[PDB]
């Protein structure tokens, strides 16, 4: 096995494989076949494939090197260099210019595959848009719940709709991005490490997004990556019933400044229950916060408010996450009374929407 | 006590008296800030009683004189998280402390001012004064070099050494050595003190870049620095430093001299082969050439050829690649310069251009 490609096609593709890599599970895998360099990194749930065109001369045959060592050692050569890579032994020769290096393999053949599988749901979407709908939602996923499959992102089509969904049982986060497609009614839960993968091979470019989603699995392909997952199992909650039944009372103000306001109420909160009290009226919102030593915050903000006046508590954390994930102009909250949940949304779309339940002072 | 002070007049202040705060206080008062009004001034002091950092801000708006304490953490959060130009006024009410500013309100405990702990009073005996870039140059040069939590006590701190015109900084973990030496225009007796290591970083920190003259006093037991607004004191390290002349090599007789950043990636690119515990790489050095080596337990293997400026003896020499990258990041030079002797000595890096800063690693067999 032998090829020469240059650092600049050589990292991005070696970043993208190797970042969540850790004993051949640590190890890349190259082959070079059909005028092509394919890299691979796989922890047997998920796998990143990567092809590079090979323009210069090149001998075919397939190995495996560590993966985070190789990834150092192409990053730490300047820019523009040329990297020739060959097998010898056991060893892979790594030489550009006068820097070589001879890294441990181990065989091609021990590094496993996930199973074979069939694609029953395909879409395309650009990747701007699956970026704006994992971020909109992505920190609303459990991480280690015993709800295992609350730990992840449902992905679901419906009409021409593609929506992520995540929640962790305290509160909830839901997109949907029309994509121009009439797709099937599905859902599937994929783990949260694929999703902070898929999120991750999100260039910023114009490539679209391919989706393939199988029985127990999902596929992406974008550019000359493609991102396979196995997905989770257990019913997913319904949104539709986390989400207020007619949140008819809606509070307009600015993100920032709420923001704000609630960061610094938080401040003199209980280190336990990081909570706030609000006390809605007309075109008021006031924050208070208090805690065991009997210190007092209070914010009085502005806001566009008609409706019966009302006292409702929150977790602080939750609310600053949803405004930090809207970044937006002004949000809108929705709410219902003091004991049910409030959803939250941006003034000008109706895109994305978060819940959270109120809080017990 | 009675004060109204733009948000932003606070902060750098707050800042600075922050900085001495402990994570785990021995007394409740140690977690809080001591805030005083006296004659058109507002002073805030923070200490953890080894080392005390006071700020003045000039009231420029009515006030009303008195003191108080209140939670440092929760204090400056609050005018950190105030709105930028937000006029915060202040007032004393019972043991609470409130603060305003717009439509926010804040009510903080406080612990009386009269309990706020003092350090021991002392005389200066030697005294100075500097420019703070001098200042901050010396400690920047030798910081990464002091110990962390060694039982050896001296060495968890920074020499600061007295001599004719100069001031100097040494420091060392027992393994390598920072020096740096600065003339800074006036005659000083012959004299050296350690600064504890937490106290060398509120030094460093308190230095804002700006064209406020630094000021030195030195007592037996205790130091002062004094620049613009901001006073800090630290106790010193009661203890005997080691010689740093006597780690100098003598007479280094076959220098090196490469380009910083091209010398650097080719240690960090080497330093992925080498031992992860004792980081050791090979230098084979021959007539403008330099050709490192590397390897592992694994037998991997990296080499770096480059051309660098050499005219000595060939020789070979084994350096900790982590201690020699350290001090290439602290130079941040054009071209450095490592004074060799042979493999079974030390060797000395500078920066090609200056003596000001010297550094020393030791050999190492392979
Ligand atoms: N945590 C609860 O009691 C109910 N609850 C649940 C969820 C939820 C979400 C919100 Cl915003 C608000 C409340 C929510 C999602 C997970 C559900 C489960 O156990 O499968 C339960
Ligand atoms: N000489 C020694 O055993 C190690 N050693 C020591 C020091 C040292 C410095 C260098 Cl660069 C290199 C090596 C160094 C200074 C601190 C000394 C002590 O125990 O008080 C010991
Ligand atoms: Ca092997
Ligand atoms: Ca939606
Ligand atoms: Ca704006
Ligand atoms: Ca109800
Ligand atoms: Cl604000
Ligand atoms: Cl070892």
Redesign the interface.
């Known amino acids: 096995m032998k090829f020469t490609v240059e650092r600049e096609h050589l990292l991005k593709p070696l970043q993208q494989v190797s970042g969540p890599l850790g004993p051949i599970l640590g190890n890349l895998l190259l082959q070079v076949a059909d005028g092509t360099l394919s890299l691979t990194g796989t922890d047997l749930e998920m796998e990143m494939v990567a092809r590079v065109a090979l323009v210069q001369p090149h001998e075919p045959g397939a190995t495996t090197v560590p993966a985070r ?1 190789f990834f ?2 192409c990053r ?3 820019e523009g260099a040329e990297i020739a890579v060959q097998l010898e032994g056991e ?1 892979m020769l790594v030489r550009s210019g ?7 393999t181990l065989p091609a053949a021990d590094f496993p595959n996930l199973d074979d599988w069939q694609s029953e749901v395909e879409f395309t979407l650009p990747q701007a848009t699956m970026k704006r709908l994992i971020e909109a939602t992505q920190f609303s996923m459990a991480h280690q719940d015993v709800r295992y499959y609350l730990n992840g992102m449902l992905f679901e089509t419906e009409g021409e709709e593609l929506r992520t969904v995540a929640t962790d049982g305290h509160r909830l986060a839901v997109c949907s991005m029309p994509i121009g497609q009439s797709l099937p009614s599905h859902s599937v839960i994929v783990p949260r490490k694929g999703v902070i993968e898929l999120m991750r091979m999100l260039d910023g470019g114009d490539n679209p997004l391919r989706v393939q989603i199988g029985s127990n699995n999902i596929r992406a392909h974008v550019g000359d990556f493609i991102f396979t997952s196995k997905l989770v199992d257990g019913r997913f909650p319904d949104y539709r019933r986390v989400l207020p039944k007619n949140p008819d009372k809606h509070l307009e103000a600015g993100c920032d400044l709420l923001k ?2 609630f ?2 109420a938080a ?2 909160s209980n280190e336990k229950f990081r909570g706030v009290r609000l006390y809605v009226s007309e075109n008021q919102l006031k924050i208070t916060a208090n805690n065991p ?9 502005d806001v566009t408010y008609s409706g019966a006046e009302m006292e409702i508590g929150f977790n602080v954390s939750y609310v600053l996450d949803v405004l930090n994930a809207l970044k937006c102009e002004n949000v809108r909250m929705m709410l219902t009374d003091s004991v049910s949940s409030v959803q939250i949304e941006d003034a000008a779309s109706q895109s994305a929407a978060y819940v959270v339940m109120p809080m017990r002072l």
Not at 98 to 104: K, P, Y
Not at 293 to 301: C, D, S, T
């Open positions: 060592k150092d050692i730490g050569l300047p060893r006068r820097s070589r290096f001879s890294l441990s704000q306001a960061a610094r401040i003199l030593e009997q210190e007092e915050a209070e914010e009085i903000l």
